[PDB]
């Protein structure tokens, strides 16, 4: 996150760091005692070298670490250049006992609409400057949902955003998520309800003509339920 603020430690206990060889790769959200939901493109890796670490604030600390038993990419995930259905479910090799620093975030009803103008936030350990370095501490940025049609404008995302995609803007031009922040959760409203998982932007993270976009969670709720084994 560029221009973001350090979270009160452990105020977002549903946060996961997906890590390759002990180095932060993507955010994730714990949505069941045994499953973290993250971005599908984050899994273009040697699974053997990946871990999920829960209950963190400083990246430089143990936190509670899990091996991954399975990585279930949405059945219709389409990689870049499409980047359609960009979600993956990761099964922990253990079961979270909910505490004060580690607990799942509830899924939204499947009938949730992320309307334009909705006030949200997101958190991550992603880069704090263009071409810089990971944040050392968990951070947050407030974001508002933009109108998708306007976001699909030729000078913006060029007709390329689908109805399952949530288009985002910070309050100022120099605030944006950046490399490391994808997979992280977009939570919206007074109830800080799960509404999105961050996906992509442009190569320049603060590019105002290429605003950050998250995958909407609601349309995927029934697949998440099937996969994690409820209904």
């Amino acid at each position: 996150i560029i221009g973001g603020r350090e979270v009160i430690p452990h105020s977002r206990p549903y946060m996961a760091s997906l890590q390759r060889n002990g180095s932060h790769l993507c955010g994730g959200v714990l949505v069941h005692p045994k499953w973290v939901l993250t971005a599908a493109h984050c899994l273009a890796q040697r699974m053997a070298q990946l871990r999920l670490v829960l209950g963190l604030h400083t990246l430089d600390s143990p936190g509670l670490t899990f091996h991954i038993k399975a990585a279930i990419q949405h059945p219709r995930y389409k990689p870049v250049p499409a980047l359609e259905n960009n979600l993956a479910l990761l099964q922990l090799d253990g079961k979270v006992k909910p505490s004060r620093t580690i607990r799942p975030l509830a899924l939204p009803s499947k009938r949730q609409v992320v309307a334009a103008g909705t006030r949200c936030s997101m958190a991550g350990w992603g880069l704090t400057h263009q071409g810089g370095r990971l944040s050392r501490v968990l951070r947050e940025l407030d974001l508002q949902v933009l109108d998708t049609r306007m976001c699909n404008n030729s000078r913006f995302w060029n007709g390329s955003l689908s109805p399952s995609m949530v288009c985002l803007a910070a309050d100022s031009k120099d605030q944006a998520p950046c490399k490391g922040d994808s997979g992280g959760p977009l939570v919206c409203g007074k109830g800080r309800v799960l509404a999105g998982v961050l996906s992509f932007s442009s190569r320049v993270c603060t590019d105002i003509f290429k605003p950050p976009v998250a995958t909407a969670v609601a349309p995927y709720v029934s697949w998440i339920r099937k996969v994690t084994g409820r209904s």
Partner: peptide
């Protein structure tokens, strides 16, 4: 064209 995962 230019989607870049926050990878």
């Amino acid at each position: 064209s230019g989607k870049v995962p926050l990878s």
